[PDB]
Amino acid sequence: ARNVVYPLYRLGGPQLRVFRTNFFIQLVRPGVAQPEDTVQFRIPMEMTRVDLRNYLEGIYNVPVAAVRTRVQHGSNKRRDHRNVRIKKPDYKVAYVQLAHGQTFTFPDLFPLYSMLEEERQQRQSSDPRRGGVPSWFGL
Amino acid sequence: IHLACTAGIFDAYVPPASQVSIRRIKDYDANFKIKDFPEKAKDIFIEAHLCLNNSDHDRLHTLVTEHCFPDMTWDIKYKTVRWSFVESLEPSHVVQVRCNVYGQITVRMHTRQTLAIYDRFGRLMYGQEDVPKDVLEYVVFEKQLPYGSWRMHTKIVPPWAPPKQPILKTVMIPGPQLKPEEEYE
Amino acid sequence: GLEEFFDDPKNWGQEKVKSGAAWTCQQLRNKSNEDLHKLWYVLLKERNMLLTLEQEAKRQRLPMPSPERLDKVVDSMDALDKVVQEREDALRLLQTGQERARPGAWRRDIFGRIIWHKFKQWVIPWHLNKRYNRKRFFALPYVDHFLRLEREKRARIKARKENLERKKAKILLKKF
Amino acid sequence: VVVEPISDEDWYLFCGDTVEILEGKDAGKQGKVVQVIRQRNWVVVGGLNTHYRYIGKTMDYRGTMIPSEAPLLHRQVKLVDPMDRKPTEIEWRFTEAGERVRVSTRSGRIIPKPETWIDGPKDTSVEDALERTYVPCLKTLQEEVMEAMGIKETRKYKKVYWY
Amino acid sequence: IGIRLTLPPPKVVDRWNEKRAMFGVYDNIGILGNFEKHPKELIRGPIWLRGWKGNELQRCIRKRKMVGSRMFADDLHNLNKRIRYLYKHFNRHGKFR
Amino acid sequence: ARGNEYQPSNIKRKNKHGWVRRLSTPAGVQVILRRMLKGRKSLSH
Amino acid sequence: YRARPPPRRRPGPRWPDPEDLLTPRWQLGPRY
Amino acid sequence: ADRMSKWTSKRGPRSFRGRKGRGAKGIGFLTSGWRFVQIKEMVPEFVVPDLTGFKLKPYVSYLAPESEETPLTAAQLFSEAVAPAIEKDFKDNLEKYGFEPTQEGKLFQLYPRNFLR
RNA sequence: GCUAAACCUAGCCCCAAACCCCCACCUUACUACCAAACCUUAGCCAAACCAUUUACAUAAAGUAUAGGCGAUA
């Protein structure tokens, strides 16, 4: 879990257990193409390779082979009108190579105004014969 | 947005046995006679067109519908319009009666009228100032079937009527133009 | 496997999904404990799915299909914590009395402010630690002057707001 | 922007009330309130107080015109009696039917207050969201789940020095 | 440019308000009240000049010695500085001496 | 052309003007107290 | 506009309770 | 010079960059020669249920009856749990009903809090 | 004709009255986890320099009194 103080360990203690986990994981289509065994995750910055391996293996039952993590530095050059630097959050990206020769690719998700259309198609735009007169007067 | 109008026309009568529509319409108000429509139709038409000369902006808003105000006003904006009705020969009359759910009526008119529209510098561009010319017109009035005013919705042009008057101005119509490579072939 | 990170395929790109009702604190209080755990992990799966969906939608620049679902589950998640934490509270007292699970005390930092020091866990007793005793927990006398100033500053702020408040009301009563 | 202090108890108008105006444009006409905006006191009324506005206006292109409903202030507009046909002041008078209900001043009339779905593939049945499966337990969540699922542990937690 | 172009909204002064319709009531509580009171003790305001007048220096001395132990630190330092300056000025500066 | 008076270095930052150099002597706590009086956002590097 | 009730001396002896620290020293001895 | 900006792992000389981790927790210690020893007892090994046969789902039906918040105040829990028990047994010492005079024994202590989350 | 003009609440000043306010942080602060505090106020400024000297409710009274018996206190 995150934002919690952990029980400390002394030699011979019990196993530290998190019976109601706090972590929240999302996953993203890689920006530059990745091996067919790699899945790319965003995980909270208070999380570790061992945590993520156990996290996936325990919750989802997806056998993981290896994990490598990288902490991305959000940009801090984008100034508000007060001229205050505004920094979007740093994040942690985890590359997870699956085991047993499996393969994966992020599937392609995502595969009152009738009045304006109807009045525009029947707008009766300027008939250049008319030369600018109001047409409508049947007189 | 509670439009006061009815988008399009359900069945626009074709220019040259509807009591169910009467039952479904007059019920919602319960005080009306179709034979009371001719006088009101001519009165609203003439007073509204006089107001078009006046340029009383609010009165035109109250009389005409949303689909009818802006197109008239924009052209009439920044150019005087000296419209005038004169003595009529033929009484107008209902053409039919048509029924979220807002109703429609149509009226046939054969009038004697005059137009004179001047440029924003005062120069004539259309119509003759005082010639009383006969006209035939088909006009649809929409009825907002609470307190729905019986406004003039639109006028419809019949394809079997003579064309429009000439125009005192000379006009070009640039059609097939040249291209930097595509020739006039 | 990983397919649980995306909802059933029929909902892909639908632009609208029937969203149920977020759980309610009492409606969870009616439930047991094991079922509470299981429902928590169910909601975890849902929250992962929805956060992934949001990130992808933001990446495409196509609109988020139905964002409210995310908010709903988050609220449910929050509610769930409260319920179990309530039982936690409703046990601490009823077997130790303590109103806070994590032990702490009141102290005076080096600047004089009264601060609530929550304790950390250590495995040597405090009196022979070398980094703990470098951390002052007392106020030398030269601090006192600044305390007064700080209090005075705060007083001014309070006054202004209170004063300004009634002026608004007064002006309002001069309209009606 | 001056809006007089009127609290919820002192306020009477709501979304969907039969409202007749006292002043302003379209005087003395009745309508309904789609929305009441308490923060700035806007009263939208169907087709009443309308002001016609151009939509689609460029430097040349004129577009269409629509009667946008200009909202109204609460003093400008009062409620409508469904029987007496007269806007009467809403003096909060306690009644046996309801302690807080709109009661007319001219006559002892109480005005009522104006204010579906199916289970999906991922929604619970109602009768299964109320089962009283909870037995009152003094054991915390951790003990109960460990005993339930058979997780085993006997190594003891060693003493620690909090401070 | 130093002039406006729109007349301000005409202020409404209610010359027959409460606090204008009584300005001076009980301003003679002594000469016809058995001299129980004194108009001095009708005038609200600061504790250090309820019924007293002096120049700026005397006024600040009175403020010090009468409320100068309840006043915030920075204000008190400003006040002592003001006494020092007004002393220097009144006692060493001017045309007449 | 002149102006090379300042070659930055973080060790010297945090070991000449840090939070644990102000709190090492009482005058430094005067400085940090002045700065959290004036309401600054950089109490000490 | 019935004017406000006229000011008066507080009708009775002033016995300031001796608890509050604001009661001035001179208003507590035997002289007063 | 960037006084305002948050101080993080990416700024200082090489020593700083090595030392200041982030919120990620430690799991073990550093033995001689810059070697790392990780303990199985500091890895927060998760627990999960078997979701088989689970009748509860992420969203509740809108049709469910509306409710009211009544937080589990301590006396309420004690009543619901014990009051029948004390009532029945008093007609014929408190550890026999559920009380725990101390907490050093059991693995899931309440105060101080040992079990995580 | 451009550029420009023009406004009036945002708030603030002086008073009264009342005594006031989950997690991480002394190591390189915001980093889960190891062998000591007390000591006069100073001199600018006036004395036309400067050396003794030189301010920090009401009335008694600027009186007794001090003072290169002087500026002043």
Curated annotation (Swiss-Prot), chain A:
Its main location: mitochondrion. Residues 107-139 are annotated as: Disordered. Residues 117-130 have a biased composition (Basic and acidic residues). GO terms for molecular function: RNA binding; structural constituent of ribosome. It comes from the Eukaryota. InterPro entries: Nucleotide-bd_a/b_plait_sf, Ribosomal_uL23-like, Ribosomal_uL23/eL15/eS24_sf. Gene3D superfamilies: 3.30.70.330. The keyword Cell division does not apply. GO terms for cellular component: fibrillar center; mitochondrial inner membrane; mitochondrial large ribosomal subunit; mitochondrion. Transmembrane segments: none annotated. It is found in: Mitochondrion. One of its GO terms (biological process) is mitochondrial translation. The keyword DNA-binding does not apply. Keywords: Mitochondrion, Ribonucleoprotein, Ribosomal protein. Belongs to the universal ribosomal protein uL23 family. Component of the mitochondrial large ribosomal subunit (mt-LSU). Mature mammalian 55S mitochondrial ribosomes consist of a small (28S) and a large (39S) subunit. The 28S small subunit contains a 12S ribosomal RNA (12S mt-rRNA) and 30 different proteins. The 39S large subunit contains a 16S rRNA (16S mt-rRNA), a copy of mitochondrial valine transfer RNA (mt-tRNA(Val)), which plays an integral structural role, and 52 different proteins. This is Large ribosomal subunit protein uL23m.
UniProtKB/Swiss-Prot annotation, chain D:
It is found in: Mitochondrion. The keyword Cell membrane does not apply. Residues 13-46 form the KOW domain. Keywords: Mitochondrion, Phosphoprotein, Ribonucleoprotein, Ribosomal protein, Transit peptide. It comes from the Eukaryota. GO terms for cellular component: mitochondrial inner membrane; mitochondrial large ribosomal subunit; mitochondrion. GO terms for biological process: mitochondrial translation; translation. Component of the mitochondrial large ribosomal subunit (mt-LSU). Mature mammalian 55S mitochondrial ribosomes consist of a small (28S) and a large (39S) subunit. The 28S small subunit contains a 12S ribosomal RNA (12S mt-rRNA) and 30 different proteins. The 39S large subunit contains a 16S rRNA (16S mt-rRNA), a copy of mitochondrial valine transfer RNA (mt-tRNA(Val)), which plays an integral structural role, and 52 different proteins. Belongs to the universal ribosomal protein uL24 family. This is Large ribosomal subunit protein uL24m. The gene is MRPL24. The chain holds residues 44 to 216 of 216 of the full protein.
From Swiss-Prot, chain E:
Keywords: Mitochondrion, Ribonucleoprotein, Ribosomal protein, Transit peptide. One of its GO terms (molecular function) is structural constituent of ribosome. It is found in: Mitochondrion. The keyword Ribonucleoprotein applies. The keyword Heme does not apply. Its main location: mitochondrion. One of its GO terms (biological process) is mitochondrial translation. GO terms for cellular component: mitochondrial inner membrane; mitochondrial large ribosomal subunit; mitochondrial ribosome; mitochondrion. Belongs to the mitochondrion-specific ribosomal protein mL51 family. Component of the mitochondrial large ribosomal subunit (mt-LSU). Mature mammalian 55S mitochondrial ribosomes consist of a small (28S) and a large (39S) subunit. The 28S small subunit contains a 12S ribosomal RNA (12S mt-rRNA) and 30 different proteins. The 39S large subunit contains a 16S rRNA (16S mt-rRNA), a copy of mitochondrial valine transfer RNA (mt-tRNA(Val)), which plays an integral structural role, and 52 different proteins. Interacts with OXA1L. This is Large ribosomal subunit protein mL51. The lineage of its organism: Eukaryota, Metazoa, Chordata, Craniata, Vertebrata. The gene is MRPL51. The chain holds residues 32 to 128 of 128 of the full protein.
From Swiss-Prot, chain H:
It holds the Pfam family MRP-L27. This is Large ribosomal subunit protein mL41. It comes from the Eukaryota. One of its GO terms (biological process) is mitochondrial translation. One of its GO terms (molecular function) is structural constituent of ribosome. Belongs to the mitochondrion-specific ribosomal protein mL41 family. Component of the mitochondrial ribosome large subunit. Also involved in apoptosis and cell cycle. Enhances p53/TP53 stability, thereby contributing to p53/TP53-induced apoptosis in response to growth-inhibitory condition. Enhances p53/TP53 translocation to the mitochondria. Has the ability to arrest the cell cycle at the G1 phase, possibly by stabilizing the CDKN1A and CDKN1B (p27Kip1) proteins. Present in kidney, liver, thymus and testis, and at lower level in brain and spleen (at protein level). Keywords: Apoptosis, Cell cycle, Mitochondrion, Ribonucleoprotein, Ribosomal protein, Transit peptide. Component of the mitochondrial large ribosomal subunit (mt-LSU). Mature mammalian 55S mitochondrial ribosomes consist of a small (28S) and a large (39S) subunit. The 28S small subunit contains a 12S ribosomal RNA (12S mt-rRNA) and 30 different proteins. The 39S large subunit contains a 16S rRNA (16S mt-rRNA), a copy of mitochondrial valine transfer RNA (mt-tRNA(Val)), which plays an integral structural role, and 52 different proteins. Interacts with BCL2. It is found in: Mitochondrion.
